[PDB]
């Protein structure tokens, strides 16, 4: 059926290239295909359009110099470069569906997952996992310093869920990341069940499990 | 540029009450092309309403926009559990197709003080030369909180960061961490290392505490 599927995530350095696929399978020259980028924590911003089937295009003013769309028959996908990327240009990049090229004006109905592009003078970097230490009792871990996002914490292998709260990453000045996850457990509990938080830093093929002792 | 403004920011409701949600234009959207997106999670915005009334295939009836010119409306009749996220509205007839700036949508409940926690770091990271303390504000409402930190009495600034959790499913809480970072050298040149937490749950600031040792 019909699917977008977008090329995976990058990091970049101030002042490189990045160019985004969206492979069209289920129907390209047929619709018209957009692109809309999304900075962590802002709303979406509209970049572009192409009309697959004759290459027409349009680019937002501002950011028109540095973005080409591009898209190639043969291989059923769009591309969209973006040239001179700054920190400002960190966002996750859909690329969508609006109506066909011969119908009237159409918004995107259909959206691809988007390329989490991460522009930094940081290099990509596994976290550090500290425990936080214990009737409820709170314990955690503290995922420090690790470049680019995303991680993801699970405890126990997934086997504990309740009371589980994993916070959005916070950028620290160092340009690396970092993250907390808690639970909430009886303290009861304490030195009768074991606490292990399953780390996964898939960008630097990093898995930590880090014990948790009152 | 067509800047679109959406207000309110945040609207706080019970599942069951009714929402409007207006997106002003700064000139004519001419043909009345004005879509109505809904964004819950990651997940990639989800088209609600084209041609400023229509709604897009398999949107429930709940969902109504109207309006023309440079005034819009999205109405939700009866607020389900799943409808509350974030709206954004987006004309798509003047390049660049701006979009609004979003309201966000959220479940109104009574209100909940925040249970703190704190954080000493550990001999891990001490061993590395940084201590990261950590304040816990759990399971709280509203979203609106103030984090203190003080080392000895002392007001901190500029060395702290906090994020917040999405409205939970089940109690409608948000929770917030907030890490205070200094390097090893300045932690073991003080004693009481506390969290100062303001909430219109609490009476009075909230203070927690510890004393390196």
């Known amino acids: 059926q019909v699917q977008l599927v977008q090329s995976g995530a990058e990091v970049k350095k101030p002042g490189a290239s990045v160019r985004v696929s969206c492979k069209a399978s289920g129907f390209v020259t047929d619709y018209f295909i957009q692109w809309v980028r999304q900075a962590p924590g802002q709303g979406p911003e509209w970049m572009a359009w192409?009309?697959?089937?004759?290459?027409?295009?349009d680019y937002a003013p501002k950011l028109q110099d540095r973005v080409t769309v591009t898209c190639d028959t043969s291989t059923n996908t769009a591309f969209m470069e973006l040239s001179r990327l700054t920190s400002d240009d960190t966002a996750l990049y859909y690329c969508?569906?609006?109506?066909?090229?011969?119908?009237?004006?159409?918004?995107?109905?259909?959206w691809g997952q988007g390329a989490l592009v991460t522009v930094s003078s940081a290099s990509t970097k596994g976290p550090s996992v500290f425990p936080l230490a214990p009737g409820t009792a709170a314990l955690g871990c503290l995922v420090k310093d690790y470049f680019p996002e995303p991680v993801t914490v699970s405890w126990n292998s997934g086997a504990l869920t309740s009371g589980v709260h994993t916070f959005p990453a916070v950028l620290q000045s160092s340009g690396l990341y970092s993250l907390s996850s808690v639970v909430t457990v009886p303290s009861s509990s304490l030195g009768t069940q074991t606490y292990i938080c399953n780390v996964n830093h898939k960008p630097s093929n990093t898995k930590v499990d880090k014990r948790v002792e009152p | 540029e067509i800047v679109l403004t959406q207000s309110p920011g945040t609207l706080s409701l019970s599942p069951g009450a009714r929402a409007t949600l207006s997106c002003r234009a700064s000139?004519?959207?001419?043909?009345?092309?004005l879509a109505w997106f809904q964004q819950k999670r990651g997940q990639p915005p989800r088209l609600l309403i084209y041609?400023?009334?229509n709604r897009a295939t398999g949107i429930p009836d709940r969902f109504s926009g109207s309006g023309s010119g440079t005034d819009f409306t999205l109405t939700i009749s009866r607020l389900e559990p799943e409808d509350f996220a974030v709206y954004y509205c987006?004309?798509?007839?003047?390049?660049?197709?701006?979009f609004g700036q979003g309201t966000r949508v959220e479940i109104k409940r009574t209100v909940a003080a925040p249970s703190v926690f704190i954080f000493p770091p550990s001999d891990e990271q001490l061993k590395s030369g940084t201590a990261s303390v950590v304040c816990l504000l759990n399971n709280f409402y509203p979203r609106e909180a103030k984090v203190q930190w003080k080392v000895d009495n002392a007001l901190q600034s500029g060395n702290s960061q906090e994020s917040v959790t999405e409205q939970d499913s089940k109690d409608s809480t948000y929770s917030l961490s907030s890490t205070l970072t200094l390097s090893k050298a300045d932690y073991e040149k003080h004693k009481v290392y506390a969290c100062e937490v303001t909430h219109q749950g609490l009476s009075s600031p909230v203070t927690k505490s510890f004393n390196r040792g």
């Open positions: 987006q004309q798509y007839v003047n390049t660049p197709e701006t």
């Open positions: 192409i009309n697959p089937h004759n290459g027409e295009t």
């Open positions: 000139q004519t959207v001419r043909g009345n092309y």
């Open positions: 041609l400023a009334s």
């Open positions: 969508g569906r609006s109506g066909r090229t011969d119908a009237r004006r159409a918004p995107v109905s259909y």
